[PDB]
Structures are given as structure tokens and as C-alpha cells.
Ligand binder design. Sequence first.
Ligand SMILES: [Mg+2]
Ligand SMILES: [Zn+2]
Ligand SMILES: [Zn+2]
Lengths: 729, 122, 119, 105, 56, 147
Amino acid sequence: DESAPITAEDSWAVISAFFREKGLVSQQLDSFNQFVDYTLQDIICEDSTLILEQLAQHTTESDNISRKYEISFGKIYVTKPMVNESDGVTHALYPQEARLRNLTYSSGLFVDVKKRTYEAIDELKYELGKVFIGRLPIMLRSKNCYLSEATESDLYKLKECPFDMGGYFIINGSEKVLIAQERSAGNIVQVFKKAAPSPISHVAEIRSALEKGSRFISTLQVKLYGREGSSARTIKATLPYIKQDIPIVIIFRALGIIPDGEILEHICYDVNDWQMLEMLKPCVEDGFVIQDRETALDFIGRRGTALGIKKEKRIQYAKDILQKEFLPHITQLEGFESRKAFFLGYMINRLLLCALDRKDQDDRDHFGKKRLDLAGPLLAQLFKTLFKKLTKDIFRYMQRTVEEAHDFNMKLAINAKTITSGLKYALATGNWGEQKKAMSSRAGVSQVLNRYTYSSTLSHLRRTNTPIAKPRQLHNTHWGLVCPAETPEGQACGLVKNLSLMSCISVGTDPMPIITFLSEWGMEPLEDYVPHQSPDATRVFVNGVWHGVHRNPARLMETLRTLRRKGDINPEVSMIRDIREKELKIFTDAGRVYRPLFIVEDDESLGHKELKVRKGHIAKLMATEYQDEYTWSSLLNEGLVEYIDAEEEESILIAMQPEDLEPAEADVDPAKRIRVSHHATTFTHCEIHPSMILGVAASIIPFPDHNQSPRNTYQSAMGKQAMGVFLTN
Amino acid sequence: DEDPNEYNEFPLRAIPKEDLENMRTHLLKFQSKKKINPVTDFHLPVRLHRKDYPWVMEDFDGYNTWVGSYEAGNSDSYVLLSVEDDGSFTMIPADKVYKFTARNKYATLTIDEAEKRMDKKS
Amino acid sequence: TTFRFCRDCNNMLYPREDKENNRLLFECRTCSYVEEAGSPLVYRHELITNIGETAGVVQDIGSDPTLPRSDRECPKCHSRENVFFQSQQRRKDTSMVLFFVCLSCSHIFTSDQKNKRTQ
Amino acid sequence: EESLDLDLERSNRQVWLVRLPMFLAEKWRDRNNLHGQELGKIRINKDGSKITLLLNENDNDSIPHEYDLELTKKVVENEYVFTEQNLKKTAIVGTVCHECQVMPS
Amino acid sequence: LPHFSKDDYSPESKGFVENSYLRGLTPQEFFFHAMGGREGLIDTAVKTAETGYIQR
Amino acid sequence: LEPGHAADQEQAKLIRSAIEHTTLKSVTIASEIYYDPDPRSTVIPEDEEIIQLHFSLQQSPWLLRLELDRAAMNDKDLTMGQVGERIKQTFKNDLFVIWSEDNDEKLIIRCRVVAEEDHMLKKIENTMLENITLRGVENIERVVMMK
RNA sequence: AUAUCA
Ligand SMILES: [Mg+2]
Ligand SMILES: [Zn+2]
Ligand SMILES: [Zn+2]
């Protein structure tokens, strides 16, 4: 009977395993680790190498000598935490010594540097170690921290409390917690109705930004001029570095899509839909003046910039803007006009779809469209601006030392204090930016960890800040991800979110294994799309980048789901199939809040649709519970349980209780609350336990289902100020 | 299974390494809308020149010109299969694919003047 | 409406009246192309629309678990297996009429007890 | 020859355009030019037109797997192949009569 | 909520808390009461400064 | 309401109607532009009967044809006659108007002007929907009756 | 400057 359905008490055996593995601050640690193991290297390699060329006067010896010098950055190293005492000696440093001597719990950052030299005469370049760069503060309990592989008895000897959970830094002896910052997800197409007094009635916006590398915060607006009842309703778009909004047509022409109808094919996918097509006639009339690719680029080039007078100059510009500043996600490469044209057309399709009252205006408050910037990405943002600060100070040195041939001394070149004190400042003060000249910088990003009570400490490491439509309200999308009660009263009410117990935040994976997988599984590339040939084609996106289309999504979706539930596709990756809209969006993306749910399958030889997890797995876990071989990961790879973010939640159907919401009806207690039914035969998932919708503080409230809504909101604020033993140490 | 049927199979010479134009076999693609007919007394002549590099294609004057631009790549790739008199096939990889990429024309004594008129509009 | 393009240009067509033979044509403003009109209707406004109601009805409509089911007997195959939704035309005014899509014959039937449809 | 001129498509030579998986092409490169680089053979089966590609045994040690081909239409397009020699002469070699995609196997 | 079928205008779907506080709230009832509860806390919070300035 | 007619619900309705703003847009199902070159004979066989009368007991070959909603034409009490009269009285002698009877199944208004005419009529239909006031006072919308 | 108090 090891394949018997699971009861309601059994959901706790799964919850036990979730916490045995993840702990209460998996988000804080998993973020930092990702930044140390991967993110750090990629930051050293984006701009990385810098060169200086000294080309002569070509008069006569000692002239006519052209040289080019290189400086390259290879592997990045990072020691265990250390300290440099006054008397030279460097030695290991444990968290307790840091807190008492007010030191910083940081470790050394070391990078392989190489310095090449080249030379030519009056075209042929011919050729003629590990350096310390800074001290990076470590987050306690992370991979790099001493306390990570520490046993219980170990911690006690180290004068640390085993109940301490890590997730903070130690800067000058005070504990500091990075607060997750909530921002709107980028590379996302959103349509909004521009209010009653406006020339423009609707706008299609895309906040395009790179996953890493400079991060061009250029937002493209696709504007529908004219109001509901105004003649000549044209569509123009505001392009980065271009003062005026160019009529869509000219953009397509400048892209290479020259005749109307070839242009129309990219926007409207149904040749039948006369309604949308009539709406495009004004645009065609607007772009009638420009007839070829060249004249389109000139028209774009005319409208500066400044203007930048000269015919050859303006046409050359528009080329650069379309390549480097227009739709920078997708590609910033050359020959990708086809990709960026179809995207613009997908945007115009969405702009018109909303204006034709077929789709709703985008919910600016949908949680699925929000990201959380944790300790990882926060340090990554800071380290970028701090490493480009160092990179361009070495260059200033290479000029100073090639002028006087003063022997390019390494220690004089790299200023360690740049990155060391640059991070120490942020973490200490809290103005997340460079440096003692901060504003606007975002203060309160780093703050001193609440140590009043143990619960107070826990709830501080799960706190979310939202800076600046109706944000304070509890959204439906906040279900299972954020606590409905734990929020402040006054000013910050509903802008300070607290994570539910089972909530985790996507660390950010690689998109290529999925893009490579897709093409191989029937995905026709956008570069060869012919809308009227395959008109029912499901459009496939990976991080707001339209990669192509697929003819039988039904089978593809099942393959991709089996890929995740096996482990082949990472479980933190979100994949959604909106059948009605004919779309398949995939997210490898960092910052997405997810929750784990039980998987339910129609798949059962014996009877109905039943929860994959059986009483045999439950005992298989409680066997491992008695041992203190079957972990949470074990349930995850056996595809019994899955991770679902808010966007994916949209397409699923969840049962609250397993047992109570599974077998149909073939007296009743009056004292129990009135409950609904398991009418659904469609159930894709089941709720592990509904109490998990609550955060750390609300989870101490006895019978919160018997209190008036705010009385609960009050307790999850007061318990933070209740006295008790905060730590055994 | 058993083959009660017959199959005609030809040997494929996986691309010969050494070819005079081993290096360049390219695809020139025209959209059907362009309606280019190779069998035209007019299109007897044709010149293909790099524009200084998009390719420029032109017939005798008075005839349309096309511009050729290079398409983006992918994991799969295209090969050109040709058949010798003997059934054997020789395959050659496509170096580049260009979408052409021509004229109209009727774009002279205009464009700049039309935009100006449009400006006399606002 | 349903409009045509110029063969040769692929550019759109503008209506021209042939004053002499009192007939409607479609001219291309990029080349010398002309073609006679199919219908006399050139422009249709449509304020009180019905196009959007039964949108996105992919044969995979049954594979959406989010969609609710009913035991209503189909007008065609008489199957008591169907998924239902409301007018997908995202307007304020819009009635709460239901559209049922057969999990066998795929025919779209409504609950409208005021009027009779075919979409 | 005539500089900047294009060559002879007038002959109406026909060729086929086939999309091949990257992995297969990788294998093909392995074949020696000296050998003549015979990668394998193409099979045309009747009882409906079916075309498949099979690698030579030399290429891999196993049972050769056939790669089915999906025949496709010319599309509303005219595809022509032009070659450029080391000499940089340009010739209009042939027109693409048929398109096909070799599926991975 | 994801526990409901689409186009559900039923009392149970659109936030009708059927139960007494003595009986207890279902997870759905609990979250909807929480949404409704949060609204009041928002105006209590805001009104406080708006009301203050009116007085001045 | 006026002293006397204070309890008279029908008097209330009369003022409600005389004050609540009504535009040609609120009654229109769709407007259409057709090429109907013979003013005397129509390419739309439906309309054939409307001509046969609004002729018995020179102009543009381009026709503006709009369909009105019977249900809408009733809630905001209106007649084809009175609607048509407004259009006729708006454009004076530079627009030739005909209309289907209140009895007749479909509700139609056929309009013609008095080289280049396509854009001209698209302006006339915008003027018609947006600027033509049928009943009511401007700025006054949703008028409710209250006891 | 953050957190908090009624
Ligand atoms: Mg008090
Ligand atoms: Zn034309
Ligand atoms: Zn049926």
C-alpha cells in the first residue's frame, strides 16, 4: 500500500523536508552564492581588458614606431575571510572576533592579470600574475563563510549560536541585512490607456535592459496618436537618442521591410481581420513619403541627436541607433533587422489589440511582472560601477607610466582601496551607490539586523522594500508569495512586503540550453517566419525575446514540463502556455518569487486524477526524519512537487486540501466552518498547506482564522517588540 | 522491415573540401512580390557589385536595382545539393544568404522634396 | 471590408473613380497599377462590435484547466462535454452571455435566450 | 571575365537547398577531402515520395540512422545560388528547384 | 484565485465570508478578508496626514 | 419639477429626455462608405425600397450609410425622422439625406454630398458622430429619475 | 538617515 493517497497530516512531513533542506533564509544565501560563484567572474570579463596605443610621428628614428599595450583579466579567486592586523600579520578571522573588535568579515579578491606588448613600423602586431584587488565582505552561512559546513558542537566552540541562521554581513562589527528591493521586470511589453486629456490614447511600453553589460535603460514607447473619436489615428514611436516619435512605417522601412503589406504582415497576423487592418491605413499614409531603406534612415538621422549636419553623417548615425539603442535585448548585433521588425510588429499588434477592446490594459500591479533584487544582484550592481571605477583608474595610470617609462609598477596601478572601501561604504551607511558623494543613492538598502527577539531577526531577513498604480493593496497575485497580514501601519503600509514561509526567489539561470533545446523540438526561427503560411503558430518567448514559433505546442509544452520535473531543465525556470493568446513565455530570469506545490495527475490507472505523492513517499521521508537519504530534492527530481511563480500560477488550477478535494460523493458536523467542493476534474496542482501563505510573524498567531483581519496585522508588528531569548550566545 | 520495394539511393559526396568556389556558394533570394524574371531579354545582362557590404544588383540602366543584405544565422545550416550526370550528389555549404534587395524605382527628383513639403506641413 | 494590394509593388491600394464608365477602381500610388473593385463598400466603421466574443478558440481550448465545464447537450453532436467562457470583447457594456465549445464536434453554442447566433 | 558581371543562370540548372542539423554538418566536415569526402547516401523511396539521409559506416560506429527529410515548398520566393571564386568571379549557378529539411535523428 | 475556475461570479469566488469568527475562515475567506482589511489600514495611514494639513 | 406636475412620473421622463445629452454616436451600430454611382438606383438591395418612396410622393456617387440600433433608439426615446432631421439641419443644403422608416426592419440613413471626395466623407462621418447633438443639454449625461 | 511609538 506504498502507493496509497496522502492524508492532510502528511503535508507536514513534506513541509518538514522543505525546511530541513532550504532553512529560513534560503533566498538570502542562495542569492549571494550565485553572485560569488558565477556573477563575480562575469563582471570581471564584460569590459575587462583595456589597451593603450602609442603611434609615433613617423619622422625618423627615434620616430616611426607604433605600439599597442594590453592588460587582461583572467580567473577570479576569493579566499576564506581574513584580517590584516597592524603588525603586518594576516590570519583567519571568525565571526565572533569580527563583532567584538568591530572588524569587517571580508575575504580577499584576487584576479589573474596579464600584460602583453605589441609593435609595428610606420600594421603587423608582434609580441615583444595573481594580483590583489580588494576585500569583499562575506555573508554568514554562505559557501565562503567558515560557518557553512559547521556542525552543532562546532558552532558552540566558536561561540556562535546554532539557532543563528546567517544571511547578514559583518561590517565594522555590526550585523547588516540587505533588504530585497522590488522593481518592475524589464524586457516586458505593456499596453496602457493614456488618460482623457491626451493627444495619445494608448501606449505600448517596453523597458528594455541587458541581463548584464552596461545596462542601457532605454524604454521604447509605441504611441497611438488620436483619441477614441478623432480622425487620423496614426502610430508613432519614440526611439532612444531621437527627439521626435517616428511613424512606425519609416522604422520598418529603415529596418528593411520596404513594401506595405510586407510591413502589415509583421503587425497583423490574420489577413481576414479587416478591423485591425483599417486601423493601419493611416500609418501607411503617414509613411508614404519615405519609400526606400536609405531615405528612411536619413529621415531618422535628420531628427537628432542635436541634428549632426551632413548627409553621410545622419544616414550613418540612423544605422547605429537601430543597432545599439533600439530594442537592445534580442540583440545589439548587426544583421537582426528581421527579429527586431517582427517584435515591433508584435508590439503594434498588442497596442491595437487593447485599443480594439479585445485585451485588457496591463495590470501594473501583477506580482508576476515584479522582480526582487536581493543580496546577489545588489552587490552585482555595486561591483559593476566599482570595477569600472578601478578599470578606468588603471588606464589613467598606464598613460602616466608610458609617458615617463617609469616601469608599470603593479602595486601603484591597482588601487585596492577602491573596491574594498567602496563596498564597505554601501554596506555600512546604506546609500547603495558611489560613494561619500551619494544622492540619489537609495538609503536603507543595508541595515542593522533586529535582535530583539528571534522572530524579529527572522522576519527582518524576509523583508521587502518597494520605493515610490495602487501598490499598498494586497493583490491576488500575492497569494502564497507574500504575507497578507505582516505589513506596517502608516506611511510604509503595503509598501513593505514580507515573504511567506515557502517563498523563494529565482537566482537566475542560462537561457541557451533552453533556446538550443527549443529549436531542436520543432521551433521555427523568427528569421524565416511567414505569418500567413503558419497563421495559428504559437509564438515562443524566452525572457521577452521572441525566438520563433511552434506548430504543435501541446506536445512541446509536455516535453518542456517533463524536462523540468526530471531536472534536465532547472526547477526555478518558469514556463507558461496561454492557449487563448497562442503564446509560450519562458523565464530563466533572476528575481521571480516562487512557491512549491504538489503535482496532481489525471494519470492513475486506478480511478481519477490523483496527487503524485503517495503514503509510501511520506514514510520514505519520515524514515529520514528519524535518522536525525530522501530529501526535498528527492521529491523535486521525482517530479512529485514543482516551483510555480506568479506568471505561471495564471495557467494552473489548485486544490486546497488533497484528501478533502479529490474523490467525489457516491450527518455533517455543525461546529466546523462551511467549506466548498472538489467540483474540478481539471486540477493540475494541490496546496502543500494553506497556512504557508503566512510569513514568519503571522505564523505565531494562534487561530488567525478566528480574528478580524487587522488584529492579525497588529500582532505581526508587536511580536517583533516582544522580549525573550534572541540567541543562546 | 524487408524491402519488397526498391529505393534509389545516390552516393552523397559530403562536400568536397577542395573546390574553386568551395569557399563561396551563396543564396540570393528574391521575394515573389518583386516578380523578378530571370528569363528576360532585358535581364540578359546583370552586374553584381559590392557597395562600399551589401551587394548591389543592377541590369542595364532603365532597369531595377536591388540591394542584398545578409540574414541572421542559426544552429542548423543550409547546404546546396547538386547532382552530377552520374547520380552522385555533391554538397556545398552555403557561405551566406542574402535577401535582395533592389530598387523600384521612381524615386528620383523626390524624397527630399516630399519630406520638405511634409514639413511645410507639421 | 477586406482590402487588396498591388501585384508588382505589394504596396496598398487607394480607390479611384472611373468618371467615364461610372465604376470604382483601386490604384497603386507607387507604380502604374489599377484593378476594378470587388465590392462597392470601401470603408466600414462598426461602433457596436461583436468581433472579439469567440476569440482564441484554438482546438487545444480543452487543454486549459482554468476553464470551467458543463453538462449542456450540444446542438450538433448532443455531447454533454464542453468548456465555457464569457464575451472576450473586453468592454464595460458587454453582456454575461456564455459561449460553450464542444469537447468533440468543437461547435460554439451560446446561452443567449434573447437572440440566436452562428459564431 | 567581364568584370563585375554575373554569370549564366539562363541555362536553368536546378539545385536543391537542404537544411541540415549542425551536428550532422559537423560530422561531415570530418570526412577526408582526399576520400572525396563521401559522407553517406541519399535514399529516395517510392510508395509516396520519401527521402532520407544516412551517414556512411565509416563516419560512425553503430547502425546508421536514417534522417528523414521533410519536403517543403519554394514559398513565395525565388532562390538562386551564386558563387564567388577565389578569382572573385561571380556566377549565377542555378535556381533552387526543391527545398528540404533534414530532420535530426 | 488559482483555486477557482475562470468567469466565476459566485459569492465564494468574489469574497463572501459565509462563516462567523467563532466558526473560522477558509483560506480563500481568510485571504479575501485580508485584502479588504488592508484597504482600511491604507486609508487610516493616508487620511492621517491629509486630515492634518486640512486642519492647518 | 414644476409645482403641479410634481407626482407625474411621465412629466419627469419628458424633462429627463429634454435634458439628458444624446449624440448621433450613441444610436449608431456602424457607418459605411460605399460607391453607389446612380443616385436613383442602389447597389445595396436592402435599401432599394427606401429609395422607391423618399423619391416619389446632380449629387456625389459616394454614399455614407449608417445603421442605427432600435433598442438604443428607444431607451433614449428617438424617431428615425427626428434623428435624420438633425443631420439634415446640421449640414443644410450641402448634404442629401434619406432614411428608412421606424417600421422597416433595418434602421438606415443614406447621405450624399452636393475630383477628390473619399477623405471629405470620412470628415463628414466624424462631424456626424462626435459633433451632432440630437436631444439634451451639453455636459449633462446619465439622468436618473428619483422619488 | 533608517526603524519605531499612539
Ligand atoms: Mg492609544
Ligand atoms: Zn504597385
Ligand atoms: Zn458537439
